[PDB]
Amino acid sequence: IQVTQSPSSLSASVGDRVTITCRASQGISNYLAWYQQKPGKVPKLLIYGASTLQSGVPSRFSGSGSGTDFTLTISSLQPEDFATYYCQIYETFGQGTKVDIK
Amino acid sequence: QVQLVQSGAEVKKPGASVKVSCKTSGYTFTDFYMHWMRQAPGQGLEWMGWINPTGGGVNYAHKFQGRVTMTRDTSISTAYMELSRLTSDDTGVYYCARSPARELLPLDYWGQGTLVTV
Amino acid sequence: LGFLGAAGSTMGAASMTLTVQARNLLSTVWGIKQLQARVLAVERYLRDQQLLGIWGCSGKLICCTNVPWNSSWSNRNLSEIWDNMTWLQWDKEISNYTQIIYGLLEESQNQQEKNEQDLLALD
Amino acid sequence: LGFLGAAGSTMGAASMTLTVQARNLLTVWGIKQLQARVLAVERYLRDQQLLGIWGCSGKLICCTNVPWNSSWSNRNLSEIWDNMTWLQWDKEISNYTQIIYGLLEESQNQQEKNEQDLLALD
Amino acid sequence: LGFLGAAGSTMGAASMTLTVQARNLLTVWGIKQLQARVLAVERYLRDQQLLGIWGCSGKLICCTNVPWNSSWSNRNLSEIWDNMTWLQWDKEISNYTQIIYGLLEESQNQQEKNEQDLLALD
Amino acid sequence: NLWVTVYYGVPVWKDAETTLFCASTHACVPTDPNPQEIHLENVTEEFNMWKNNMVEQMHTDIISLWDQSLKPCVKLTPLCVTLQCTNVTNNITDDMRGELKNCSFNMTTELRDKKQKVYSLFYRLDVVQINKEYRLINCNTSAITQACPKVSFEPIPIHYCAPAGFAILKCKDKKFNGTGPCPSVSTVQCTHGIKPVVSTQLLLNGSLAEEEVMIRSENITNNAKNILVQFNTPVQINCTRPNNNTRKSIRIGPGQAFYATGDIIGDIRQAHCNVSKATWNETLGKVVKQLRKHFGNNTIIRFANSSGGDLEVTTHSFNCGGEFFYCNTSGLFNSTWISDSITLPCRIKQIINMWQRIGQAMYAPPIQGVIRCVSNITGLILTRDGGSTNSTTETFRPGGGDMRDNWRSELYKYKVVKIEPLGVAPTRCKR
Amino acid sequence: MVEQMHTDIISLWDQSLKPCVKLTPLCVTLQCTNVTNNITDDMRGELKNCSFNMTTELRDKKQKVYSLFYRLDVVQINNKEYRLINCNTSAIT
Ligand SMILES: *[C@@H]1O[C@H](CO)[C@@H](O[C@@H]2O[C@H](CO)[C@@H](O[C@@H]3O[C@H](CO)[C@@H](O)[C@H](O)[C@@H]3O)[C@H](O)[C@H]2NC(C)=O)[C@H](O)[C@H]1NC(C)=O
Ligand SMILES: *[C@@H]1O[C@H](CO)[C@@H](O[C@@H]2O[C@H](CO)[C@@H](O)[C@H](O)[C@H]2NC(C)=O)[C@H](O)[C@H]1NC(C)=O
Ligand SMILES: *[C@@H]1O[C@H](CO)[C@@H](O[C@@H]2O[C@H](CO)[C@@H](O)[C@H](O)[C@H]2NC(C)=O)[C@H](O)[C@H]1NC(C)=O
Ligand SMILES: *[C@@H]1O[C@H](CO)[C@@H](O[C@@H]2O[C@H](CO)[C@@H](O)[C@H](O)[C@H]2NC(C)=O)[C@H](O)[C@H]1NC(C)=O
Ligand SMILES: *[C@@H]1O[C@H](CO)[C@@H](O[C@@H]2O[C@H](CO)[C@@H](O)[C@H](O)[C@H]2NC(C)=O)[C@H](O)[C@H]1NC(C)=O
Ligand SMILES: *[C@@H]1O[C@H](CO)[C@@H](O)[C@H](O)[C@H]1NC(C)=O
Ligand SMILES: *[C@@H]1O[C@H](CO)[C@@H](O)[C@H](O)[C@H]1NC(C)=O
Ligand SMILES: *[C@@H]1O[C@H](CO)[C@@H](O)[C@H](O)[C@H]1NC(C)=O
Ligand SMILES: *[C@@H]1O[C@H](CO)[C@@H](O)[C@H](O)[C@H]1NC(C)=O
Ligand SMILES: *[C@@H]1O[C@H](CO)[C@@H](O)[C@H](O)[C@H]1NC(C)=O
Ligand SMILES: *[C@@H]1O[C@H](CO)[C@@H](O)[C@H](O)[C@H]1NC(C)=O
Ligand SMILES: *[C@@H]1O[C@H](CO)[C@@H](O)[C@H](O)[C@H]1NC(C)=O
Ligand SMILES: *[C@@H]1O[C@H](CO)[C@@H](O)[C@H](O)[C@H]1NC(C)=O
Ligand SMILES: *[C@@H]1O[C@H](CO)[C@@H](O)[C@H](O)[C@H]1NC(C)=O
Ligand SMILES: *[C@@H]1O[C@H](CO)[C@@H](O)[C@H](O)[C@H]1NC(C)=O
Ligand SMILES: *[C@@H]1O[C@H](CO)[C@@H](O)[C@H](O)[C@H]1NC(C)=O
Ligand SMILES: *[C@@H]1O[C@H](CO)[C@@H](O)[C@H](O)[C@H]1NC(C)=O
Ligand SMILES: *[C@@H]1O[C@H](CO)[C@@H](O)[C@H](O)[C@H]1NC(C)=O
Ligand SMILES: *[C@@H]1O[C@H](CO)[C@@H](O)[C@H](O)[C@H]1NC(C)=O
Ligand SMILES: *[C@@H]1O[C@H](CO)[C@@H](O)[C@H](O)[C@H]1NC(C)=O
Ligand SMILES: *[C@@H]1O[C@H](CO)[C@@H](O)[C@H](O)[C@H]1NC(C)=O
Ligand SMILES: *[C@@H]1O[C@H](CO)[C@@H](O)[C@H](O)[C@H]1NC(C)=O
Ligand SMILES: *[C@@H]1O[C@H](CO)[C@@H](O)[C@H](O)[C@H]1NC(C)=O
Ligand SMILES: *[C@@H]1O[C@H](CO)[C@@H](O)[C@H](O)[C@H]1NC(C)=O
Ligand SMILES: *[C@@H]1O[C@H](CO)[C@@H](O)[C@H](O)[C@H]1NC(C)=O
Ligand SMILES: *[C@@H]1O[C@H](CO)[C@@H](O)[C@H](O)[C@H]1NC(C)=O
């Protein structure tokens, strides 16, 4: 299952709308999950089941989409929020993406 | 509470066999399948495999078939993995993750993290 | 008299006192024994009650119908049935045809309720 | 108002809200639970049959031919239906309840027989 | 035909097959068999009581005195009763059922008191 | 104008969950010879064989049945003693090189002041070397009980029925891929025969696909749902225990008679299984042709033996003439397909942690004389390897273990629904 | 009525027997002797004075205790060694 993250690199500032997508091969419906891995620390789960989000997750993090293309979006951004993010599909983990201040 | 402790950092030389452990506490061990994951330094996180803690069912991926072998121990509530015939590319970080039932997307909660130097 | 007082009486006298019977139809492994005994009793009563109500005869004990009485079942004029016979012998006599009686009663009630709704359809 | 709400209210007031009180009428732990449930079912069936042999089947309210007797209550109708609660009424006539039931059942049986005879009058 | 014989058929062809469906509503295992049987009897009794508080007791068919608010449905008689299945109908009016039931009960109550007044007139 | 009317006893149903009851234990209500199958017409009903609750209910029922069958039997708690073992070397072949091990031990008698000295021939998998001293496998994890010799427990047809106010809906469509709107539907008073077979990696006996092989999966392509493969036609299989074995009684107290192996009569050989190679080849060809639909008409396919785990899942595990056979299916699932009789060695056990539970280990008594088991193989339980492999051969391996899936191989055509017989509608009738 | 009454009485018997101590420990070798202490010629060798080891409150301590049994209830082994008649057949409560 081909997975193409987008954008590979991204620079964003505090408190702005930031969206990240991943292209799939065919349709997988809600079947999708996104995770975060702050450098050094263990990866943690952000979104699963397509839009469905994890417990204890601030509502600023929200994902959705359909077909081959979905999007995880954040509006508010506190300094801990930016990190490496990973889209995931089946046994076809995303390459990841880089999020940095400004 | 739900705690997934993982083995300590291990250092080694090529050609031997390396073993890692992931101990769980706080939940019904047999209910949730366990995926093992690996990421090379500064790379993506490739999926090592998955194990069923109800009958010992396991599935690997060819990328890493015939070299890996993982089993379970229900008494102490733990999952063990081993890798033989290592290659220098295999140096990197390994992780244990938890998925409900016979499902594979939601990798809720995670281990401390092990590093292996080939 | 009391329970089954007119067990062997003539048909009319027994029919005059149908209420006592109607009342008397209703009242740790011995626990489940009594539970299944009572639920079987309740189920039998409710099955009989529904079998009456499907004929429009619920709410009554002496319910009249409009099935023509095919003489093939029995040709005994009313004198013997209602003055010279008991319920047991009679039930023995029409045991072989009671199912057909039930079916004809179903059909007749269905036609009658449909005709009643049709009459009410008029403005 | 809801369950038992008119219990302390006037007779006339409570006589308008019968349905709200009628619909709410109906390993050892499962044993006691099933015993209680079957008891409740059998009690509702008690009442349903007892109304059925009174010609009052399926009506929460029903008039019958049996006449009142001043011995049972020397009570003016306004007092009964606009001044005195249901509980006090059940308490007052608790003695004479059985004779009322017997007379009522006899009247219903006589009514059924008369109805049957009239239907055949052709 | 039989049980659920005309479930997918047109509306009227099912309308005269009600008797079969109406009739066919009646340790490790003994307790569970008891639980299932008593659940069935409770369900039947609840249905019978719901019919009885609407005055339709003992009749599979019945008629009521509530106007049909077209908000619940606007389909004319031919469309419903010649080109539709019962499952589709229950799907269509699912939300409004409760409201209907309430109105039905209320109508019966009003009607009933009216009847009593007529039986009170000398 | 239009007026409401209430219709009682109306053909309307909704999905629901409730208890069912058998038909055919000492408590089953006998069935009847009238399999009344009222063919519902112009109907189309959604099905999800992966979430029909009754399969789990059936599973739970079976579990409880097993427990109640075992409780009034001897508990071999005194049997957990040190075993002075010797590897058997009498007429033993080069295939079974020291599996049976005849072990002396002291055993309690009717008078616990006295004792005795008895023997046995426990198989290797049940005995572990404590340090020449051995112990039975379960003596540190869980207690041990024995099956009562009376019951010859085996597949007995157990029909199912719904309790007086619920309906059972079939799906007569012969291409039912397990999920979606089934076009042809028909109800039944009770289910047909379902043998409660216990088998992993190979669904022994049961119902076969009517027209063609079928592949069922809640999601074919997510490598985590146990794929079921229902065969169009059966595959004959013959499993055999050819060692002439005897049985002896040992008094373990006031009336507790433990049935122990005494000695093997005549020669000793490996207990093996056979399957017609040609028919198996044709059926697996059929299976891969069907799989080409879901995985494309230009994909290589690979079949490789089980990937590991417990003994019960790594091998075909099942029952045969009272004994428990563990056949190694690596000799079948070894092939590759591009766009005579196979023989299976099998081991035997006497201590079984059936239903993959912890705390209840059952001792299966031996059975006098050789044992034969002829059966129809009806379907497989597979899993896709994965590895993504760009575009490459996708590898399939036998799975199983979770016995519930086997129940789903016979409870997929069915569903349970609840009747809502009090409907309403508008009509021109006024009170 | 008779069959179901018989079954009910059997089950009552079993239920009443159930909440009572199990008496496996008497399944032990019995050292028994005749009794001729103010005996009659009629009761010759019908009662037997038996003794045996027995458990205690604490599992380590064993007590040598004696009681009197009836000949119909006891069987010889193959001296003066004896056992309960039912001990070879089934449990005892
Ligand atoms: C699948 O169905 C077949 C066919 O019924 C089953 O074969 C049956 O196997 C049992 C033992 O497991 C046999 O029982 C024994 O048979 C003879 C009867 O004379 C005798 O040795 C014993 O008294 C005992 O009853 C049974 O006969 C045999 N049936 C046939 C027709 O050969 C098979 O076991 C089933 N598969 C599974 C996994 O259960
Ligand atoms: C299973 O297949 C094997 C291999 O063909 C059979 O082994 C032969 O069995 C026959 C008797 O059936 C012997 O006479 C031959 O000597 C065996 N030949 C070998 C091992 O090469 C075996 O019998 C079959 N078992 C069955 C049908 O139960
Ligand atoms: C299993 O054994 C049975 C006999 O017990 C074999 O049945 C024969 O099968 C052939 C086809 O292979 C039929 O033509 C014969 O009529 C059958 N004979 C009998 C006596 O039933 C069966 O072939 C054996 N299976 C294998 C794989 O060898
Ligand atoms: C299951 O049977 C297969 C087929 O006989 C076994 O595979 C052989 O195993 C032997 C012994 O380890 C090896 O020498 C061979 O090279 C294996 N052959 C192949 C083609 O792989 C297998 O070992 C058996 N498995 C078990 C667990 O007994
Ligand atoms: C599955 O097949 C593999 C080969 O793909 C078998 O590997 C053998 O394993 C045994 C030990 O069980 C070794 O002694 C052999 O050397 C292995 N053979 C080869 C050719 O590598 C394995 O036995 C099989 N496993 C099962 C059935 O569980
Ligand atoms: C029985 O028959 C005789 C007929 O005269 C009569 O004395 C009696 O009343 C009858 N009664 C009953 C209850 O059978
Ligand atoms: C009456 O029943 C007989 C059989 O008992 C049948 O032959 C006859 O046709 C029936 N007549 C009717 C219903 O008029
Ligand atoms: C009834 O019929 C019988 C013959 O079956 C006859 O003796 C008797 O007189 C009849 N009675 C009447 C009232 O017609
Ligand atoms: C209680 O009684 C008073 C008069 O004493 C009346 O005003 C009031 O409405 C009654 N309340 C109810 C709930 O009936
Ligand atoms: C009224 O009751 C009294 C007392 O029981 C009784 O004597 C009298 O006959 C009764 N009158 C009526 C008409 O019921
Ligand atoms: C009813 O009877 C009582 C008795 O004292 C009398 O005072 C009262 O006026 C009467 N009430 C009516 C007719 O409403
Ligand atoms: C009811 O019965 C008791 C007991 O006989 C009697 O003393 C009492 O007066 C009666 N009560 C009424 C309210 O009539
Ligand atoms: C099914 O639909 C067809 C038209 O497609 C109609 O002719 C037929 O009567 C319907 N069958 C039933 C049983 O309603
Ligand atoms: C209930 O209302 C919702 C929202 O409009 C609608 O989706 C559904 O179909 C309605 N169901 C009915 C009227 O049965
Ligand atoms: C029996 O012999 C086999 C084969 O040499 C050996 O592996 C095993 O350890 C021996 N067992 C005992 C108990 O001596
Ligand atoms: C195992 O050892 C016992 C020791 O007495 C012997 O009787 C028995 O024959 C041996 N078994 C075999 C199969 O040689
Ligand atoms: C039986 O018990 C004795 C001690 O009473 C012990 O020495 C002997 O080894 C035991 N027998 C076996 C076969 O272990
Ligand atoms: C029991 O012994 C077995 C021998 O393999 C071992 O695997 C297991 O951990 C032991 N269990 C305990 C609770 O000591
Ligand atoms: C099952 O088949 C139906 C009908 O073609 C289809 O809609 C559905 O997607 C299929 N399900 C799967 C899991 O392939
Ligand atoms: C095996 O298939 C045959 C095919 O004729 C069938 O008759 C037989 O019943 C099947 N046996 C079993 C045990 O399922
Ligand atoms: C997986 O199956 C579920 C349940 O039918 C469905 O929602 C989903 O779309 C399926 N996905 C596939 C076939 O890729
Ligand atoms: C039989 O198996 C072989 C294994 O190579 C395969 O090529 C062949 O296609 C199979 N038979 C048929 C008729 O296809
Ligand atoms: C496995 O399959 C190969 C062909 O891929 C064959 O040569 C070999 O004999 C098979 N091994 C077995 C049955 O052990
Ligand atoms: C096993 O050997 C004994 C020797 O008497 C014989 O009775 C029995 O039939 C044999 N079993 C078989 C299956 O040949
Ligand atoms: C009690 O145990 C002793 C050994 O401690 C034994 O010699 C004796 O036989 C037992 N008691 C009797 C009465 O035999
Ligand atoms: C035990 O031995 C006694 C000796 O009298 C005998 O009566 C009894 O039947 C034996 N037990 C069994 C189970 O046969």
Side-chain angles (χ1 to χ4, degrees), chain D residues 15-20 22-27 30-31 33-34 37-38 41 44-45 48 57-63, chain E residues 27 31 34-35 38-39 41-42 45-46 48-55 57 101 105-106 108-110 112-113 116 119:
Chain D
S15 42
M16 192 156 148
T17 71
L18 282 303
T19 39
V20 51
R23 61 168 64 268
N24 314 326
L25 197 168
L26 165 142
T27 292
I31 273 297
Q33 145 172 26
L34 290 206
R37 259 212 285 192
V38 166
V41 161
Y44 181 87
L45 265 286
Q48 206 79 95
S57 78
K59 305 193 309 303
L60 293 192
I61 209 79
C62 160
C63 324
Chain E
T27 72
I31 208 65
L34 263 284
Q35 285 218 246
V38 74
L39 161 68
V41 175
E42 300 147 49
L45 255 298
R46 276 191 193 285
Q48 274 300 337
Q49 190 192 24
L50 257 288
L51 275 170
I53 73 181
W54 298 334
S57 95
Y101 293 168
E105 175 294 336
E106 181 46 4
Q108 166 47 213
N109 220 336
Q110 299 295 63
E112 164 33 64
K113 190 157 293 296
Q116 193 195 28
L119 285 180

Side-chain angles (χ1 to χ4, degrees), chain E residues 1-9 14-15 18 21-22 24-26 28-29 32-33 36-37 39-40 43-44 47-48 50-51 54 56 60-68 72 77 80-81 86-87 89-90 93 100-101 104 108 111, chain F residues 1-14 18-22 25 27-29 38-43 45 61 64-65 68 158 163-167 169 187 418-431:
Chain E
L1 298 84
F3 199 5
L4 300 98
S9 186
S15 174
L18 313 151
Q21 289 143 36
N24 270 359
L25 306 175
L26 298 169
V28 55
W29 271 27
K32 299 296 183 181
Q33 188 207 237
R37 271 286 163 193
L39 161 68
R43 184 171 320 310
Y44 177 89
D47 283 18
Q48 274 300 337
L50 257 288
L51 275 170
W54 298 334
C56 304
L60 309 187
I61 274 283
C62 168
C63 293
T64 36
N65 183 10
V66 309
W68 175 271
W72 315 331
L77 287 163
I80 289 172
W81 297 81
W86 263 111
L87 313 104
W89 181 248
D90 179 304
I93 64 169
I100 276 143
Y101 293 168
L104 288 175
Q108 166 47 213
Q111 165 253 295
Chain F
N1 293 350
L2 304 170
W3 304 78
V4 175
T5 170
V6 307
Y7 287 27
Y8 187 29
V10 69
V12 164
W13 69 69
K14 328 191 292 299
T18 37
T19 317
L20 295 50
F21 69 83
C22 88
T25 64
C28 271
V29 195
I38 272 296
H39 182 305
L40 312 205
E41 194 34 68
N42 296 22
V43 194
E45 171 48 85
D61 181 65
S64 193
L65 202 163
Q68 73 69 21
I158 176 176
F166 296 97
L169 277 45
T187 179
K418 181 172 82 167
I419 305 292
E420 201 206 340
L422 178 63
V424 302
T427 191
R428 296 170 24 226
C429 86
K430 183 196 170 198
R431 191 177 280 174

Side-chain angles (χ1 to χ4, degrees), chain F residues 196-422:
Chain F
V197 194
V198 179
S199 309
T200 59
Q201 295 180 358
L202 264 174
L203 318 161
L204 272 293
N205 294 4
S207 154
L208 328 182
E210 271 176 351
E211 56 186 41
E212 305 301 340
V213 171
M214 286 308 316
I215 302 146
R216 311 187 202 289
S217 50
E218 163 286 321
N219 287 140
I220 193 89
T221 172
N222 67 355
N223 73 49
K225 304 343 213 180
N226 302 340
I227 288 92
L228 289 48
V229 165
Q230 183 168 4
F231 278 131
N232 174 21
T233 87
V235 189
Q236 174 49 264
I237 184 159
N238 296 350
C239 264
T240 310
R241 223 204 68 69
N243 311 315
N244 192 342
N245 186 352
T246 193
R247 195 175 56 183
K248 88 207 297 185
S249 180
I250 303 171
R251 215 144 274 101
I252 319 303
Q256 285 69 336
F258 161 44
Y259 296 79
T261 76
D263 195 324
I264 319 307
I265 286 159
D267 303 317
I268 287 163
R269 271 161 299 103
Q270 182 44 279
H272 65 284
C273 216
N274 285 351
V275 292
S276 164
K277 185 181 179 181
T279 61
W280 173 267
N281 194 21
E282 307 336 304
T283 38
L284 211 63
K286 268 177 36 171
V287 170
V288 294
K289 297 336 179 181
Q290 283 283 1
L291 287 150
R292 290 213 188 288
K293 292 165 166 178
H294 289 217
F295 291 91
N297 200 0
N298 62 336
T299 189
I300 310 299
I301 215 73
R302 253 178 60 180
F303 277 111
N305 67 339
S306 37
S307 195
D310 292 328
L311 187 33
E312 81 196 70
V313 59
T314 41
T315 37
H316 175 194
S317 69
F318 72 111
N319 299 123
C320 164
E323 290 274 51
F324 288 61
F325 276 39
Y326 295 62
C327 289
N328 158 18
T329 64
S330 192
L332 287 172
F333 301 115
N334 155 33
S335 68
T336 302
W337 313 64
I338 317 306
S339 177
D340 267 318
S341 322
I342 302 304
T343 308
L344 272 181
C346 317
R347 271 73 64 72
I348 314 293
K349 284 181 82 181
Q350 303 203 18
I351 309 299
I352 309 106
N353 315 284
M354 181 54 31
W355 311 132
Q356 38 273 50
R357 284 181 297 156
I358 288 284
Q360 291 160 319
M362 183 276 280
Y363 173 90
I367 298 103
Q368 279 97 294
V370 305
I371 314 180
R372 285 281 297 211
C373 290
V374 61
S375 35
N376 308 15
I377 273 284
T378 79
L380 281 54
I381 285 192
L382 300 78
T383 303
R384 190 169 45 83
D385 184 1
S388 64
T389 81
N390 65 90
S391 160
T392 308
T393 58
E394 295 302 320
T395 320
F396 283 142
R397 312 179 151 291
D402 192 351
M403 233 76 60
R404 272 184 297 206
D405 288 344
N406 182 312
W407 305 141
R408 272 199 280 278
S409 76
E410 277 65 27
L411 264 52
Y412 68 99
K413 294 209 311 313
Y414 293 52
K415 187 174 85 163
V416 66
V417 285
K418 181 172 82 167
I419 305 292
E420 201 206 340
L422 178 63

Side-chain angles (χ1 to χ4, degrees), chain D residues 66-77 80 89 92-93 96 99-100 103:
Chain D
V66 163
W68 200 257
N69 192 11
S70 78
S71 70
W72 306 328
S73 70
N74 304 97
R75 276 291 152 113
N76 235 347
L77 196 60
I80 298 166
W89 182 234
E92 205 290 328
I93 85 187
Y96 319 147
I99 171 160
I100 298 324
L103 273 172

Side-chain angles (χ1 to χ4, degrees), chain D residues 21-120:
Chain D
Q21 265 190 136
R23 61 168 64 268
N24 314 326
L25 197 168
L26 165 142
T27 292
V28 165
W29 278 237
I31 273 297
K32 56 162 170 53
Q33 145 172 26
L34 290 206
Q35 180 139 16
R37 259 212 285 192
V38 166
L39 155 54
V41 161
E42 178 133 353
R43 157 176 303 258
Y44 181 87
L45 265 286
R46 254 47 196 171
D47 277 353
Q48 206 79 95
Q49 195 215 149
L50 188 41
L51 279 175
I53 36 162
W54 289 351
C56 305
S57 78
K59 305 193 309 303
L60 293 192
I61 209 79
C62 160
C63 324
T64 36
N65 288 0
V66 163
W68 200 257
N69 192 11
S70 78
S71 70
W72 306 328
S73 70
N74 304 97
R75 276 291 152 113
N76 235 347
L77 196 60
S78 177
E79 193 169 304
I80 298 166
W81 295 94
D82 303 348
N83 269 24
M84 183 178 146
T85 68
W86 264 115
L87 278 159
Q88 301 162 224
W89 182 234
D90 170 302
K91 269 179 60 43
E92 205 290 328
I93 85 187
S94 82
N95 290 67
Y96 319 147
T97 321
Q98 185 56 28
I99 171 160
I100 298 324
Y101 293 10
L103 273 172
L104 186 63
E105 179 265 17
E106 171 285 347
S107 73
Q108 175 56 26
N109 201 344
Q110 166 52 213
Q111 184 69 246
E112 265 151 292
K113 183 54 160 41
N114 274 6
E115 210 180 44
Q116 184 214 30
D117 159 15
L118 282 174
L119 281 148

Side-chain angles (χ1 to χ4, degrees), chain C residues 32 35-36 39 42-43 46-47 49-51 53-56 58 106 109-110 113-114 116-117 120, chain E residues 15-16 19 22-27 31 33-34 37-38 41 44-45 48 57-63:
Chain C
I32 54 197
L35 268 282
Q36 82 218 98
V39 77
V42 160
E43 183 178 2
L46 277 164
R47 178 133 193 78
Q49 205 287 336
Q50 187 207 38
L51 178 50
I54 192 64
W55 296 320
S58 166
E106 301 315 346
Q109 174 61 12
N110 260 116
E113 66 76 18
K114 268 293 294 201
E116 192 76 89
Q117 195 216 61
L120 302 175
Chain E
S15 174
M16 81 295 293
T19 72
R23 190 181 301 73
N24 270 359
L25 306 175
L26 298 169
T27 72
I31 208 65
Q33 188 207 237
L34 263 284
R37 271 286 163 193
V38 74
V41 175
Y44 177 89
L45 255 298
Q48 274 300 337
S57 95
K59 313 172 76 202
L60 309 187
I61 274 283
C62 168
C63 293

